[PDB]
Design a protein around this nucleic acid. Structure first.
Ligand SMILES: [K+]
Lengths: 120, 120
DNA sequence: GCTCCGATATTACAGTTGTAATTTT
DNA sequence: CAAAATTACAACTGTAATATCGGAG
């Protein structure tokens, strides 16, 4: 009946899951621990949560649960970014891009690259 | 050690206060209720919370409170977006921009608008 | 005086999230 | 010191309800 969301800490599990396509909590724990610095009890909880929310699902490979995504990366990211831009920016997308630009956040080469992603 | 956040509902009040520069709780309530439909008991609560977190301050005008922001809009939105993009996009800004191009579809007008902003 | 009102303050209560520890299998 | 499920628990959020203070009468 209710829709759920991916929390900020949950984005890390998701990203890792997407990277590995198919992975135990352990596989995921090792990786996250190279980046961020969290307890395996923590990472395991986040996993559980994503699972109860139905963002991820699992199969038992030889006794151990493997986790995989049930939502497509680009779709949910966009969905998310679209939602973020709307709460923060009254000007929408262009406004965001303008904000990043006036904060010299983009290098000459970067502006180059974006003009190519556009020039499609 | 405490740093506070602006919550999702709160970005509504914050934007109104930045537009109006100077507003009473009632000003703000009247404005929000045009767009979104929230109780004033809610809006007042969020103004209070934003006040207690130190994002907005107030001086009294004929016994009525006038709220104003203490944080520079462009900095805070930028800092916020920098945070969001990094948690969601392993590829950062350009990854996000690409994501919209491959998902969203808008005219050569919009594509130009951006190109005009990038170009500067 | 105290009386009623709108502005402001205090309080409520559950769902989400960060950050885990304890229990079961 | 397993892996997985259960429980913990305060802070932060959404979403208000209720209580009270300072003036217009
Ligand atoms: K950069």
């Amino acid at each position: 009946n209710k829709t759920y969301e991916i929390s900020s800490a949950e984005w890390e599990v998701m990203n890792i899951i997407w990277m590995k396509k198919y992975a135990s909590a352990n596989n995921i724990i090792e990786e996250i621990q190279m980046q961020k610095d969290w307890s395996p009890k923590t990472i395991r909880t986040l996993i559980t949560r994503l699972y109860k929310k139905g963002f991820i699902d699992r199969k038992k490979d030889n006794k151990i649960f493997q986790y995989y995504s049930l939502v497509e990366e680009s779709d949910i990211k966009y969905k998310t970014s679209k939602n973020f831009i709307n709460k923060v920016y009254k000007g929408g997308f262009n406004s965001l891009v303008l904000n990043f630009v006036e904060k010299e956040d983009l290098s000459q080469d970067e502006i180059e690259e974006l003009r190519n992603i556009l020039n499609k």
